[model samples]
Target: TKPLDGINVLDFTHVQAGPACTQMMGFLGANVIKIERRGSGDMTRGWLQDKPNVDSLYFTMFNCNKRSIELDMKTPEGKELLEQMIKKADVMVENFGPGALDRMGFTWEYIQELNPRVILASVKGYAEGHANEHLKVYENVAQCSGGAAATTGFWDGPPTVSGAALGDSNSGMHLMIGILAALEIRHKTGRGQKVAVAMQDAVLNLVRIKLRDQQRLERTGILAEYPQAQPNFAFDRDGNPLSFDNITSVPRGGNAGGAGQPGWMLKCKGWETDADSYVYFTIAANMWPQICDMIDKPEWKDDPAYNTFEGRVDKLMDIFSFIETKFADKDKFEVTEWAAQYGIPCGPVMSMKELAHDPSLQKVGTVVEVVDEIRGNHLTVGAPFKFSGFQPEITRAPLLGEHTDEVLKELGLDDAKIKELHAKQVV
Candidate 1:
């Protein structure tokens, strides 16, 4: 019924990164079987709880549409059972700490020997041979090491990490691409291959524009697109006066569009009370006259200092200040609608609360309300893209070992043998 229909995924992931990849495969119609530690399941099941004795929303959000089975891989019987599962699986995914699987005797060579057609995928904090690969990495660590934090916040303030899950979830999305590509290749070669995505590498890849600007700094010694490169434009984190010298590399222009175009977040009518009551507007060279007219500054359309994009770059603060003054009294949503009339690209700075209640997003299925027996009805983001022929239905995450008995039976284990394994604490 879906692109990955009939595919079987042996998910050995925990927390965010590995679970994210397998969940995507599950959404695409793969039968994902999650193997967790006996008695203690995914660590996230207990993270950020609003109530006790139930799986947290964090776990439910990332682990829907999959089956859970408990196994202690340290036991010989558990190891043998995993080998059997891998032999029948089409894809095997894990994001354990470095060398954890190899220590358990499931190295690449052994996996290939057991099932040459099974795809072995993994997500790690860093690639092999890197100096810091041995160290455990989390989201902020990846962001800081991957060049994102350095170029993320205000030029004068401390380095900042983004609210988005760039390190954990983005790496999973990148791994999903590699796994899907491997699946396509297996159709032709009839053999599976290894797929790996390093969290730092993924974060760096996502912020490649920053890398591009880094190289540009080497060539030109300054990035004109950045606001900090301008003269007399110093400001503190609280918008107070500050002094700074010349910048040798790209400096973070808070809320400014990173692309070559000139844009900024202007305060709206309710900005004094509502922090997110702002609108972002970009002044493309060709839309200069339209912007002038929208702001009632048509007289300045022919001014030499503001006529061309290059000239405006030198006076970006002046232009944005004028626009901000005009927008100071208007609602951001009204400004956005009015800007649309002139074909100018603009958007309101919507908050998470706004997005959650936005009827348009809910109508398009970007935001979905899922009912769970344990957690009750809750809202969660659904699959991002649309498929003409198939739409994935979001399902509740499984309880710990909810499908262990059923899955073991499918693997040809009799109830008596299942009882024996239970007695041995192997399942």
Candidate 2:
């Protein structure tokens, strides 16, 4: 049996963050009932439409192994049914704007009173009482407000947002941890508690390394490890200088590893046409001789100015420039293979398309083809890890209100009441 085989989750969430958390529960074998409005369901149902009269890929991708039910919380009958569901739920998750549930007369106090064992989990844009708590926040907003945007990209460029949805999806994962912890506590205490995860807080947690540098800047007056600290540097056509004094705060390290080891994304063969034809590799003290040999610069391995780790840091620009010339003629994969032979750490930059079509990932079921009657066949990410005992079954998202009648019947509502509620547009 799966870990959450007996668990029931009341998924009152939309868009990305909240759905991501609850869907993970479903993947672990929880029975997830997703509540939506009567006429229009989750707003993401129509977001980024790739076809007519079908759910969008945005909605389908995040919501799988879930049963959808339509309920207008504004209506009295709908509210009553929601209360009934709350009493039976193991967990109730939501990502509405602040006070939305409270306005619906389902405050935390009311929820706990309804079911003392129910875990009330929420995902908000910010923590309570912060100045920006009142403001609506999206992924990029969270990245900017957190430390990510400020410390990413080139130093001369404007604050940049990462391609990854660090704010939305990551907050969901964080909330999932809180939910699991509450579940474990409930197992011991026979009672549940409220769990809240803020998007900005989650993003900040992910970017803690940048915050560390920010703190370190106060003591050292400069981040000496950063590539911007190199003395002999020049700007490329993009107007980004190779080096600058980051005395006040942490400057962007660009593609540099930004750690004790020095690394960079070097262009390789086909880089002129393919944007992702590059490999990132780090050079350690021991690997310096190997790197020099690989690039046909064996003589530099004995040179005093280029031999030591500290010396290479001082001449980082010259070292990278020389490496770039050698890398420009070789394929990124070839560079990675050569590095691997010498026990050097390296990875070729891969595009989304490359990852999606990867046979190795397909063999292990990291990516799978999900078939739906309406949308036909489509590709989607599968569970992140494999369990020794159980493997999850990936299913397509449900149609709007597809399980309303069935779920209501299971809730002990007779056919007459179900029909009457449907007539009243209450679910």
Candidate 3:
């Protein structure tokens, strides 16, 4: 039996943040019932379609392995239907704007009263009681507000947001953790509770390393590992030298290591033509002798000036540049193999194009090719967790209101009532 076999999830989420959580639970065998609007359903269904009149990858990728039913919440009959569903639901997840649920009259207090055993989970832009809690936030905005944008990118460029779904799906995963923990608590409490995660908080959590660097900067007045700490290496837009003298916060260090270990992105063969044909090489302090052996620089093995992180701070960039030359004719994989012999921490920067078709990823089921006859078979990320007892067999996403009649029947509504509701535009 699957872990979430008996769980019933009332998914009132849309777009990336909320749907990602429900879909993942669906993969784990939860009976996730996705609730959508009567007319358009989730906006992602039609957002960026590559094929005409088909649900976009955006929708299918995030909404798979779940059933969907469209209901107009503004209608009294629909509100009654929701109440019935809430009574049976083990979990109810939502990503609606602030006060939106309150406006609908199904506040957390009301939902708990409706079903004491049902867990009410929510994803918001900011934590409740935060100064900007009421303000609407999206992916990029959350990245900015959570301190990711400030510490990302190069010192010469504007604040940059990562390509990763640091705000939306990341927050979804965090909420999922909260919901699962709440479930564990409910087994003893015999009652449900509210679990909320803010996108800003999730982003900040993932960027916690940057926050560490921030405090360290204030305390030490220098980020010793950053490229800026190297004399005459880093420059600003005005060609001014950048160092701890003018820096207060953590500035981006390009491809430099975040801390702990000294690393940089080194070029490989074909790097001039292939943008991602590079490898990240780390000069771990403990592996200094191994690094020296590979680079044919045994003299530096005991040299005080170049042997340690502190001694090499002013010339770390020069060392990285010299090591890069050794990889000039080698491919990323070849360089990786060569580095592995010396026990160095190094790996290639895998491109999206390369990763989508990587055999190793496919073998492990991390990248699944969902078979949807409605739309041609396409690739979507599968469950990241690997279970020894069982694995997920992901199904296709639902069409708009595809399970409306089916769900109504399960709710014990007969054909006559279903027809009446359809006619009244209530379902």
Candidate 4:
């Protein structure tokens, strides 16, 4: 059996972060009961503004492996029913805005009153502080505020936010950590506690190195120690400081081009048609000679101007230009294949389409297809970690309230009570 087979989670989350956390619990064999608002349910249910009839893929992805219970918490009966469930539940989770749950009369103290054993977990935008005041803080905003923007992207271009929703996803990971820690504490204390995670805090935690840099900047003249070309800070002719984003070049560590080397994504053959036909090549220290031997450019290996890491770094632009020209002549797969043999770190940029249907991933059971009676058969990512004795079955995401009556029946609610709740739109 999976570790959490007997556990029950009361999920009151609406969006990506909270749902993602509860979904993982459900995946681990917990019986997750998602309590959503009545009628339309999660606002994400109506997402994909241009798509019609179909529910949001955004919601569907993170809401799998669970049951949905519709309830109108504004009504006294509904609120009472939820409190009753909380008393029996092992965990209670939510990701509403600041003070939202408190406004609903469900504070940590009230939760302990309902069920001293219930782990109350929540995700907020930011911990109560100066950063929390910003009402419009979103994914990229959290990443940027947490130093990801400063460390990301080409040294010359504007700082870039990662494509993934790190703010939302990182908070979800934090929520999971909090929930697990609370569960462990419950084991020791025989009582539950409040578990809170903030998106901004989680983002900052993910980029703690930047916080180190923020302190390190005071002791050094260099912001980063990358062995590239001369670090070029955009300053006025009069030596006045300019904007941080106005980077003109890298520092002394520029020339190292292999996997550990600092460089940018380069376009390769078939880039225009095949999205995967791109590679990120870097200039590795000492490996340049090996690379030269591999590429039949042996003459450059012995040249004093090209031999040393420093010499190559000083002429990084020219080296990158030369590599790009060579890359343009080769397909991404061809380059990656050849580079790998030499212990080089290289990969062709792949998309969701490629990853989903990859034979290699499928062979290891990293991908699975399950049939949803309503949505038909669909592919899904398999459980990431594997264990010796447990093999989880990949099931389709449940339809709205599909298991509500069944779950209520299991909770010892008679058919009559369920029917009444359904009639009152409180199922």
TM values, all candidates: 0.96, 0.95, 0.98, 0.86
State candidate 1's TM-score.
Answer: 0.96
Candidate 2 TM-score over all chains jointly: 0.95
Q: Candidate 1: where are CA atoms >4 Å away?
A: 235-245
RMSD of each: 1.9, 1.9, 1.0, 4.0
Q: Could you tally the backbone clashes for each prediction? A: 0, 0, 0, 16
Q: Give the local distance difference test score of model 3.
A: 0.93
Which ranges in model 3 have alpha carbons more than 4 Å from their true place? none
In order, candidate lDDTs are 0.88, 0.87, 0.93, 0.72
**Cand. 4 Cα-lDDT:** 0.72
Worst 10 contiguous positions by lDDT, candidate 3: 253-262
Among these predictions, the greatest lDDT belongs to: 3
Model 1 Cα lDDT, one tens digit per residue, 1-427? 6989999999999999899888888878999999998887998998988789888988898899999999999999999999999999999999988899999999999999999999999999988889988877899999998988888887768889999999999999999999999999999999999989899999999789998988888787777677765666867767765332445656677767786477888888988899999998898888999988888887779998888867776688888888888887789899999899999999999999999899998898889887787678778777787899998888889999999999999899998999999999998
Q: How far is candidate 3 from the true structure (C-alpha RMSD, Å)?
A: 1.0
Q: Candidate 2: what lDDT?
A: 0.87
How do the residues 277-343 of candidate 2 rate in per-residue lDDT, one tens digit apiece? Answer: 9998787778888888777888889898899867776888677777778777789888888778878
Q: Summarize candidate 4's per-residue lDDT along 1-427 as a digit string, tens digits.
A: 9977999898898777888888878777888888877667788777883357656666666777888877788777788877878888999998877777888889888988888899989887777675454353678888876666666754335677888778887788789989989888999999998888877788878777556555655455344334322334333446654442433322112223322455646778988887767887756665787778766788998888788766654565566667777787788878888788887666777778888888988776677665566655666666677778787665666666667787678668887898888888766
Rank ordering of all candidates by lDDT, starting from the highest = 3, 1, 2, 4
Q: What residue runs in model 4 are displaced by over 4 Å at the alpha carbon?
A: 49-51, 129-136, 155-157, 223-259, 272-276, 299-308
